[PDB]
Amino acid sequence: DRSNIIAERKNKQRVLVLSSRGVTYRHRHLLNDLASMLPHGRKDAKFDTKSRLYELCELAELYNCNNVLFFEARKGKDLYMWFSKVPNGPTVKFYAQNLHTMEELHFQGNCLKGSRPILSFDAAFEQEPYLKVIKELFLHTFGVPQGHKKSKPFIDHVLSFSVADGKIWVRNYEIREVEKVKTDINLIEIGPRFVLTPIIIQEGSFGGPILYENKRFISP
Amino acid sequence: GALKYLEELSKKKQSDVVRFLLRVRCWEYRQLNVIHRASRPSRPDKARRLGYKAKQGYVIYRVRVRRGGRQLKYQRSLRATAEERVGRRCSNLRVLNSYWVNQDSTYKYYEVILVDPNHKAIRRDPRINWICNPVHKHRECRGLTSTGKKSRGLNKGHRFNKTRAGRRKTWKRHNTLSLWRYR
Amino acid sequence: MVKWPEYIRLQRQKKILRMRLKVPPAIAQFQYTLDKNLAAQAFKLLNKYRPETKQEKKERLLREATAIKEVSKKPYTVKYGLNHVVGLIENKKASLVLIANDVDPIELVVFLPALCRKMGIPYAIIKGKARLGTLVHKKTAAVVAITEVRSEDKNELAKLISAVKEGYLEKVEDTRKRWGGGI
Amino acid sequence: GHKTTRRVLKERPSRRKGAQSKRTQFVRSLIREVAGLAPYERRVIELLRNGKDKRARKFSKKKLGTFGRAKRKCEELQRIIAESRRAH
Amino acid sequence: TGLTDPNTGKPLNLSRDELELIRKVQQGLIPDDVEDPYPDTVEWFTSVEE
Amino acid sequence: HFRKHWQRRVRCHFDQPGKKVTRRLARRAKAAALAPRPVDKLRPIVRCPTVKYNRRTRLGRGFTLEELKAAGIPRLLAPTIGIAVDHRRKNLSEESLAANVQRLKDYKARLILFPRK
Amino acid sequence: INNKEGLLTALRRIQLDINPKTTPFSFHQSVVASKRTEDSIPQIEDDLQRELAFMNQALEAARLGRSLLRKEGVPFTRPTDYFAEMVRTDATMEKVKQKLIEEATAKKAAAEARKQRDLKK
RNA sequence: AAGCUCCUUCGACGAGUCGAGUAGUUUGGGAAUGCUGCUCAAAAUGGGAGGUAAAUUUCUUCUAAAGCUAAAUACCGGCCA
RNA sequence: UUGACCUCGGAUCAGGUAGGAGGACCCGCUGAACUUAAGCAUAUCAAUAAGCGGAGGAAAAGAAACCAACAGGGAUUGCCCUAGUAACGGCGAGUGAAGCGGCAACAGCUCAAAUUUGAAAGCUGGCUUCGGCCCGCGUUGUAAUUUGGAGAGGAUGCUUU
């Protein structure tokens, strides 16, 4: 046994977070904030944009990771997300904006790194299928397997994914206990704030035939 | 075409024959002086592409420079310090160029090419007699060599906006209040 | 006790170090030099093909100019010059190559036994960069090549070439790929 | 925007300003054999001969610093293994 | 501590200063243990004659 | 914006009438040396880069090699008869080419050339 | 372009068998809320209401998850003795504690300025 | 000696340098804006900088680590007016 | 025994050169505080002053590893405008460009990478009847040819000293 899962049925998941060659400190801090939360992931930096998309696959095969979260930077100003099942599974592309990182002293919330989250989804993540595919991809990227030996055990935070206009808004809150008056959970927000606008669904790993197209996207 | 084979050898300087030669030469240079005269360049391909010629008037000087920090960092490079010490030693010559020749755990070793502006073999050659002009006195002190141009940021592009025409000249121009007659 | 001068001691310590360290097998092959008989028989042919000196080149020019005031074939000499000989090696225009064993930037001659092996030209590492320079009327000569000889001595050149591929390159065969020194 | 009759340009002689000549590739293959291998290249060659190709790509990446250079170095060292085996 | 030359030579006699100078540069010039640091040269390029 | 010492770095321009005299004397001094020749070299007609100024057209630096060969002027002669030559610029369209080989053909009609010695 | 059947086809190949029939809540810990939360938000520029809507969404996710987690039974609340490493640097909490000092001390010192000028009138 | 033309022939281009991590400095400029120091340390249908959601890094434009060069510009000093 | 070659030294040997001054303007190095923010530490002051090194009549820069996204521009420098724009900001203090455009002036080149190899063809000195003789440098490379919007070598025919 090599997958370090102590559970009745092992959820073998790994992610590989990556960066482009021109990200900003705001996009760099979202690597550090997301990877700190994400206990079964490896950090890597500065993928060559002159390479091809499917060289992100054997990069992840080199590190035994079935998920990849790529931060691609264009113009030195714009963050673009990529969630993908590495061998042959589907992928996604987002435009990320309205960034607010953990280093900014205005959130007043904190939690253990590596602790297991609760995934707080939205109602439209169930009824409409283009939200459903990214739902399973979000759930796998933040999978945090059961018997993972790098995970701290007590649960104190919940990740909230909600769609408002056409865009998904992420939220992170800390579970805190205040006793009821003759204990209820009060949420204090911890970490990353970003707004996630879908762009495409591709049926391949990083190419493959196009499945969803967001025909309302105003590019920067 | 022996020099094409030497250019590929300097590329592979961690390799077996080049690590051996750099080890046995760095040992020899430590017993020598801090600044001393070399009869021929240790890397004749590198010296020649930097301007060295086997003429009366061209000399090669080898210098070791202490390595490490000055966390204060010296903006003057170790190569520029290598040029400035030799030009002080040879006040009659002109520093043409310099190149890396060896390094150690304490020292870094450079070979500098110098040209005699008073030798009339040099004075008669149109390819080198520009250096006989007195605007080229002590080029290593004004940052006019290849190390100096790198550290002064004299490169084209939007990345070098503040330094491509002179950094202090740019600051004086931008900080000048210009008043005309018919305002 | 007594004290030795600085450059005196460094000459001996470099000799010890170059022969006792773990020498890579491109410098260690230079420790193997051809026999006294083969060197003498090589210079018997090569001295017959000595280049003309400056005194007798000027005399011949005065001879031909005089006859114009009041018919030859291609001159066969010994080819020299590192950049010239390497090109003659690369175009397969050379028949026998002689390489000095004491070139003090040794990088100028490290590739040269293996380059002659790749193109098939018989080579022999010889004692003396001074000896080859004497043969070619200079102070020094790193490499000496023969390309074509006159018809009176095509047989003794082919005999000398066979004496190199039998007397020198056969013994070098399983000892040119091995590291030198040790301890 | 505006429509113009685009011409066909003569080939710029600065295309591929590095090496594609057969002479330079001969020199690089000669110098690599006469000079030997770097200490980190001996590590990768040992791992590539032992089949640990997964470790070899990682090790070249930490030494060189870039995944693209790590692929090229492991490709070049793999060819050396191939042509050394044939000569043996 | 005389040790015989590896090329089947002769039991050497150099002074202690001569032995220390050998050990000084050998420490700076040694790849590692375990793997063979000094292999023979396989002529993978000069075996084929141009 | 007077936080720094703007007193020490203020430049007036009372030499504006005097520099104009020098500049006009430099053009007269140049025309004394090049007495039958024009002062300035011939320059090509080029289109301004951006979308803002695409419709405008200005003088460039020098004529392309294809423009010179189409007009019939050899390359090595053009700097010696008052034609500026740019090796960096390319033509990329027939409209840029045809406008300049008309200009060079018009230059040759108005040009009078004197023999060497 | 929104190919529908191929979209769910790709979902099958990465579908985990998340179902309370066999898989407990401890496996996935994923909660889908009944409220749309787009109906909760009247205007997207209302920063107070938009923050409350996402907070309210994570509210019922947290309470429902807490109830299911005790029914299966895991250690849910960190005890007083688990000195475990935070997702934030400790010094970051030190400077955010200093900022909460500065904001709150400014409010009460301004109230002292009120009482001085209440004497003035 | 030189320029052009044509071609069943060739066409070499700068390495402890790029680059990766890190510290200092600096800038309007965390593709570090630039530079310097330390550790490691490249390529050859190569390298650099851009453009682009447009479906894959498609296209665009230049060739770094060698060097020279008048003019338009500055000028509380030098010879004068 | 002799004679080279390399390397390191000596010489009141012959021929040269550097120092110091000046420093308004120019090129590098190093580098501060008050002040402002009605307190003050990031910041500003200021990449300034003081200190150190090095040049000229100008210096520096300079013939794209550039700008651009065009119907394209085309070395460097300076003026006007861009523009108190973009950008960065105890987002307070504030700091603060560049491309395009109109002008002034305009100029382009030298190497390394090649085998002259049917001829080191190159150069410093000395003696000189000034005409041409010796020594030395140099093959670990001095001339000629070439420098990537190129070029080489053949062939062919016109045109140039």
TrEMBL record, chain A:
Residues 13-207 form the Brix domain. Keywords: Nucleus, Ribosome biogenesis. It comes from the Eukaryota. Its main location: nucleus. One of its GO terms (cellular component) is nucleolus. GO terms for molecular function: rRNA binding. It is found in: Nucleus, Nucleolus. The keyword Hydrolase does not apply. GO terms for biological process: ribosomal large subunit assembly; rRNA processing. Belongs to the BRX1 family. This is Brix domain-containing protein. The chain holds residues 22 to 264 of 316 of the full protein.
TrEMBL record, chain B:
Residues 145-166 are annotated as: Disordered. Residues 149-166 have a biased composition (Basic residues). GO terms for cellular component: cytosolic large ribosomal subunit. It comes from the Eukaryota. SUPFAM superfamilies: Ribosomal proteins S24e, L23 and L15e. Keywords: Metal-binding, Ribonucleoprotein, Ribosomal protein. GO terms for molecular function: RNA binding; structural constituent of ribosome. InterPro entries: Rbsml_eL15_core_dom_sf, Ribosomal_eL15, Ribosomal_eL15_CS, Ribosomal_uL23/eL15/eS24_sf. One of its GO terms (biological process) is cytoplasmic translation. Gene3D superfamilies: Ribosomal protein l15e (3.40.1120.10). Belongs to the eukaryotic ribosomal protein eL15 family. This is Ribosomal protein L15.
From TrEMBL, chain D:
GO terms for cellular component: ribonucleoprotein complex; ribosome. It comes from the Eukaryota. Residues 1-20 have a biased composition (Basic residues). GO terms for molecular function: structural constituent of ribosome. One of its GO terms (biological process) is translation. Keywords: Ribonucleoprotein, Ribosomal protein. Belongs to the eukaryotic ribosomal protein eL36 family. This is 60S ribosomal protein L36. It comes from Chaetomium thermophilum (strain DSM 1495 / CBS 144.50 / IMI 039719). The chain holds residues 23 to 110 of 110 of the full protein.
Automatic annotation (TrEMBL), chain G:
Coiled coil: none annotated. It is found in: Nucleus, Nucleolus. Belongs to the EBP2 family. This is rRNA processing protein. It comes from Chaetomium thermophilum (strain DSM 1495 / CBS 144.50 / IMI 039719) (Thermochaetoides thermophila).
